[PDB]
Amino acid sequence: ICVNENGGCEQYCSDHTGTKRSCRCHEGYSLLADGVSCTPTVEYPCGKIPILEKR
Amino acid sequence: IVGGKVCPKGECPWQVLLLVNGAQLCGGTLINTIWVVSAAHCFDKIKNWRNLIAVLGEHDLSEHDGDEQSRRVAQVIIPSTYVPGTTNHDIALLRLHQPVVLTDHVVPLCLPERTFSERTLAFVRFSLVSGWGQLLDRGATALELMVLNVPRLMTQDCLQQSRKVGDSPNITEYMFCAGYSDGSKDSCKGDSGGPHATHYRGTWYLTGIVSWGQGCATVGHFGVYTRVSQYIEWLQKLMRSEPRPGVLLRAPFP
Numbered sequence: 001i002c003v004n005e006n007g008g009c010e011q012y013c014s015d016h017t018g019t020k021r022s023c024r025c026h027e028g029y030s031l032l033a034d035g036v037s038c039t040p041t042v043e044y045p046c047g048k049i050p051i052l053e054k055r
Numbered sequence: 056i057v058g059g060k061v062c063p064k065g066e067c068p069w070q071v072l073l074l075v076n077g078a079q080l081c082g083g084t085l086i087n088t089i090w091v092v093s094a095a096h097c098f099d100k101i102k103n104w105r106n107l108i109a110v111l112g113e114h115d116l117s118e119h120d121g122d123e124q125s126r127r128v129a130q131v132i133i134p135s136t137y138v139p140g141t142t143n144h145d146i147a148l149l150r151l152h153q154p155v156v157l158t159d160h161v162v163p164l165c166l167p168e169r170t171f172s173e174r175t176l177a178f179v180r181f182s183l184v185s186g187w188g189q190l191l192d193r194g195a196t197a198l199e200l201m202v203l204n205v206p207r208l209m210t211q212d213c214l215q216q217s218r219k220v221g222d223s224p225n226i227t228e229y230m231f232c233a234g235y236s237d238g239s240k241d242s243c244k245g246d247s248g249g250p251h252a253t254h255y256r257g258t259w260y261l262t263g264i265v266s267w268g269q270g271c272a273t274v275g276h277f278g279v280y281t282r283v284s285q286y287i288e289w290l291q292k293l294m295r296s297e298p299r300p301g302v303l304l305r306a307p308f309p
């Protein structure tokens with residue numbers, strides 16, 4: 001699953017025994033209930049540009 | 056950076072400036088509050104390790120606006136496979152003496168997982184390269200931080216599309232090509248160590264390090280970058296290690 005379109009994960013993807021797939025997020029983020037999306041949990045998460053994020 | 060543009064202040068918040076006795080040495084990338092990724096070759100000529108300073112939040116070298124954060128470098132970690140004066144394994148992991156404070160102007164770039172970097176990030180065509188390096192081959196360096204968007208090439212295509220030189224370094228599996236062969240755009244001397252940052256679904260990741268190239272924006276050539284995906288596990292293990300006296304640390308690779 002992870003090989004194609006990142007297993008639908010916004011960030012990290014882990015294949016499991018069978019048709020199972022777990023999406024994961026970098027530190028400073030948490031995985032949403034959709035099981036694919038990652039949202040910041042901190043003020044300064046890695047890889048995001050505060051001046052552009054704050055619009 | 057040749058043929059790029061000024062990175063608007065705060066838009067490259069992971070960019071590091073490395074200084075030796077106050078003089079421009081290389082670039083680097085902040086990956087968390089304590090750790091910076093740079094190029095091993097930046098340190099080939101260092102005599103006194105205590106004169107090495109990392110600057111975060113820097114934008115314009117002619118002025119200080121109070122967003123800058125300077126730190127002493129407590130450790131320079133280089134793979135055992137790197138040979139001074141050569142190009143392969145061109146990566147260094149720097150431990151800052153005190154953490155930087157994350158602000159709007161100081162933010163780490165994500166160090167991705169190996170699989171995600173190899174299966175997904177390696178196929179994103181364009182990535183950003185940045186630095187205060189030469190604006191032209193044989194030219195003056197930049198005063199304001201410059202940024203350039205470059206396409207990545209598969210090694211086979213880079214070799215096919217490149218002019219043959221002789222005594223030219225081999226492009227290994229620890230490297231990748233990115234840029235243009237038409238003489239317009241490239242990273243340059245003084246940009247070394249800086250980030251090759253890849254965007255994927257709203258987040259930026261570390262994929263390369265400015266390493267080497269034939270001149271700068273030379274017709275028939277591309278910029279060569281360290282393939283960071285090969286070093287993920289090596290970097291993660293070292294970030295969990297305890298510091299050791301004597302700044303320079305050669306760490307086994309793999």
Ligand SMILES: COc1ccc(-c2ccc(C(=O)N[C@H](CO)C(C)(C)C)cc2C(=O)O)c(C(=O)Nc2ccc(C(=N)N)cc2)n1
Nearest residue numbers: 077078079080100116117189193194195196197198244245
């Ligand atoms: C940003 O602030 C400064 C301040 C001073 C200089 C500088 C300029 C001229 C010279 C120099 O060699 N001047 C002679 C006379 O002594 C000339 C014959 C060029 C006039 C030396 C330096 C220096 O860095 O020590 C420079 C400057 O451009 N230095 C510099 C150093 C090394 C390289 C290299 N490795 N190719 C490239 C450039 N930058």
Ligand SMILES: COc1ccc(-c2ccc(C(=O)N[C@H](CO)C(C)(C)C)cc2C(=O)O)c(C(=O)Nc2ccc(C(=N)N)cc2)n1
Nearest residue numbers: 079096242243244245246247266267268270271272278279
């Ligand atoms: C692989 O090992 C080394 C070792 C040393 C250098 C180097 C030599 C002199 C200089 C140099 O002239 N430095 C002066 C101060 O001495 C500046 C004022 C430019 C910082 C810079 C560098 C550098 O690390 O970028 C370089 C080197 O020049 N690197 C490099 C990086 C990218 C490109 C490109 N994409 N076209 C081209 C060249 N590489």
Ligand SMILES: [Ca+2]
Nearest residue numbers: 126127152153
């Ligand atoms: Ca310090």
